Ligand binder design. Structure first.
Ligand code: MG
Ligand code: MG
Ligand code: MG
Ligand code: MG
Ligand code: MG
Ligand code: MG
Ligand code: MG
Ligand code: MG
Ligand code: MG
Ligand code: MG
Ligand code: MG
Ligand code: ZN
Lengths: 190, 170, 63, 52, 107
RNA sequence: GGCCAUGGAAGUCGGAAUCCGCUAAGGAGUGUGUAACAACUCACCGGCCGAAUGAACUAGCCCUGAAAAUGGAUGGCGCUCA
């Protein structure tokens, strides 16, 4: 239908300074700065005030309009990453074989080392992405805390850890072993 | 490229009926040869008359009343598809009744593969009230204080080669 | 077949049941629940002779 | 043995799914169409069967 | 068609009970069970009627009919949120004895 | 904890039933969970925001349907607001 114009309104909290130039968004907050390039999308930005930003698509078709609220949501996630942080909690699920999880450092790189998963002699290593913090929960047995400013990196490292623990050649309805994301929240509780 | 015509015809007078009723149709045709042809096409869809037994009385061009006034038109259609016969209603923005019908013919060719031969124009009405506009693709141009840019302008060059980097500002 | 003029007694012996409107609503609760058994309820099944006095058949406005 | 709290967390990823009837795809339970192009985004779905 | 008839019966029984008794005060609840509500009306057979329903229908179906029973008018801005009605007329103390009686609490 | 089946089945094994009463709200119950209940979840009604929403159908382009043997043919190159 080629909608003539479609708009979304970003909301900037008091301590956050978004900064946009040539579709390169740099969001600054109390917790730090995050940057993202959006050169793969045709959008335009207008600063309504210091607390609001208009995001506009002119004469956009259905898919190109669909790509507008995703831009809004990504920048909002950047804003809440530098003002609240992100925290994913993972629970270790096993029926028989305890999962031995350590945070090791090899070749100057941080890794998550999973051992004895379903009794295997194999040692699983997951690279920890930059800007992502791992911690073994003390308050909970068999719990890993993945935290950081960027939601994308945190959720993708968590997914890496979950995916490396997939069960093969078994009835996965019965063999429910693995490492699963149990809680998706923020560093600053709300 | 079309014109709107007023075509008036009648059955040939007989000693039984020496003044048959005069029937008029508004025909959108490229020229007067097709206008009188289209007239007989529709009379034989409605009345017991033929070209051999009838007579064309008058053919006149109907010019737009306000050709520099922007209007919204609603057009009622009856077209044939590959499978059946369908009624449809669509809306067009233009300054002349003829230019809306030309847009209509381009529009049904593109989205429904309906050729000129497959379309009957039931009615063309200028929508006076903003509440009369039913379709969103023309209603979006009736909003207050409408502004929009034209991003990514492509300039047509007379030369094959240009010595400076291309731009698309506008 | 009952009432045997005692279906109110079953309502007033089970007086602690249906928190209805005015006592006769309790009788309907036994009316509705006993239909799930299916016996000689005045000849047929309930949800019928119930629905007679539900709209208003003979007379049970007992006080 | 897995505690019931953890068995529901695991079942969210292993069991709570819908399956495409023509090409065998693991789909979200609420999905109305299959996401795979090979089957034509069919609406012929059915829940993933459970142990019994 | 059924909803507009059940809407009509609702406004019918709303104005039937409005003139039959009188004067009502604030009557709001939350986290109240269905058996919780059956307890109050079990003892409040005839002395009070538990008028129930919702919000948006109650406000406009009375606000437009502020002609045969005006008086209220500015009384409508009171109706906010989960609010029922206990149609009665007694005294500021004689109703809270029979109504506030049952309480269900939680940590 | 409806009736009967049932070792037990109380809504969530299985059969006649599918009602009533309070309700604005609620099925003799849509699921997970129990040996069984319990438990929570839903069906429907509430509060909240407030301007649109759901269903069936028609036919255009595209996709699935669409498997053969030398390497290879919208004539070739190549072409995607063509
Ligand atoms: Mg096997
Ligand atoms: Mg005829
Ligand atoms: Mg158009
Ligand atoms: Mg045009
Ligand atoms: Mg067009
Ligand atoms: Mg034809
Ligand atoms: Mg040039
Ligand atoms: Mg289609
Ligand atoms: Mg497809
Ligand atoms: Mg094809
Ligand atoms: Mg061209
Ligand atoms: Zn599929």
């Amino acid at each position: 239908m080629k909608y003539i114009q479609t708009d979304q309104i970003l909301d900037i909290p008091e301590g956050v300074t978004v900064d946009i130039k040539a579709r390169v968004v740099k969001v600054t907050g109390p917790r730090g700065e995050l940057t993202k390039d959006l050169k793969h999308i045709d959008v335009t930005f207008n600063k309504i005030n210091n607390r609001a930003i208009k995001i506009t698509v002119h004469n956009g078709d259905r898919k190109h309009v669909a790509a507008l609220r995703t831009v809004k949501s990504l920048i909002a996630n950047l804003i809440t990453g530098v003002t609240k942080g992100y925290k994913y909690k993972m629970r270790f699920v096993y029926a028989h074989f305890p999962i031995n999880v350590n945070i090791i450092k090899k070749d100057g790189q941080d890794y998550v080392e999973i051992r004895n998963f379903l009794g295997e002699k194999r040692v699983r290593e997951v690279k920890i992405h930059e800007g992502v913090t791992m911690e073994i929960s003390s308050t909970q047995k068999d719990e890993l805390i993945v935290s950081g400013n960027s939601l994308e990196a945190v959720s993708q490292n968590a997914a890496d850890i979950q995916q490396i623990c997939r069960v093969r050649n078994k009835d996965i309805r019965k063999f429910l072993d693995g490492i699963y994301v149990s809680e998706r929240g923020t560093i600053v509780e709300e | 490229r079309l014109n709107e015509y007023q075509v008036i015809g009648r059955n040939l007078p007989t000693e039984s009926v020496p003044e048959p009723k005069l029937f008029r149709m508004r025909i959108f045709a490229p020229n007067t040869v097709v206008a009188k042809s289209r007239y007989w096409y529709f009379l034989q869809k409605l009345h017991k008359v033929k070209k051999a037994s009838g007579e064309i009385v008058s053919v006149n061009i109907i010019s737009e009343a306000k050709p520099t006034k922007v209007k919204t038109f609603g057009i009622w259609l009856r077209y044939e598809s590959r499978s059946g016969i369908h009624n449809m209603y669509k809306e067009y923005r233009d300054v002349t009744r003829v230019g809306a019908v030309e847009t209509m013919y381009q529009d049904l060719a593109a989205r429904h593969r309906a050729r000129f031969r497959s379309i009957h124009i039931l009615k063309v009405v200028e929508l006076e009230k903003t509440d009369d506009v039913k379709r969103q693709y023309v209603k979006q141009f009736l909003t207050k204080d409408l502004k929009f840019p034209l991003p990514h302008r492509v300039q047509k060059s007379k030369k094959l080669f240009q010595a400076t980097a291309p731009t698309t500002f506008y | 077949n009952i009432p045997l003029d005692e279906i109110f007694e079953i309502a007033r012996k089970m007086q602690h049941k249906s928190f209805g409107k005015n006592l006769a609503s309790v009788s309907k609760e036994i009316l509705g629940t006993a239909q799930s058994v299916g016996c000689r309820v005045d000849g047929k099944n309930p949800h019928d002779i119930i629905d007679a006095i539900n709209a208003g058949e003979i007379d049970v406005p007992e006080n | 043995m897995i505690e019931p709290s953890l068995k529901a967390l695991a079942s969210k990823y292993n069991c709570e799914k819908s399956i495409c009837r023509k090409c065998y795809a693991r789909l979200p339970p609420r999905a109305t169409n299959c996401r795979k192009r090979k089957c034509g985004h069919t609406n012929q779905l059915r829940p993933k069967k459970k142990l019994k | 068609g059924g909803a507009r008839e059940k809407k009509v019966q609702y406004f019918s029984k709303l104005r039937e009970l409005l003139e039959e008794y009188k004067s009502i005060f604030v009557v709001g609840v939350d986290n109240v069970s269905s058996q919780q509500m059956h307890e109050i009306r079990k003892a409040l057979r005839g002395d009070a009627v538990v008028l129930m329903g919702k919000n948006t229908m109650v406000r406009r179906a009375i606000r437009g009919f502020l002609s045969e029973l005006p008086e209220f008018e500015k009384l409508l801005p009171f109706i906010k949120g989960n609010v029922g009605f206990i149609f009665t007329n007694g005294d500021l103390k004689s109703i809270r004895d029979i109504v506030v009686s049952n309480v269900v609490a939680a940590p």
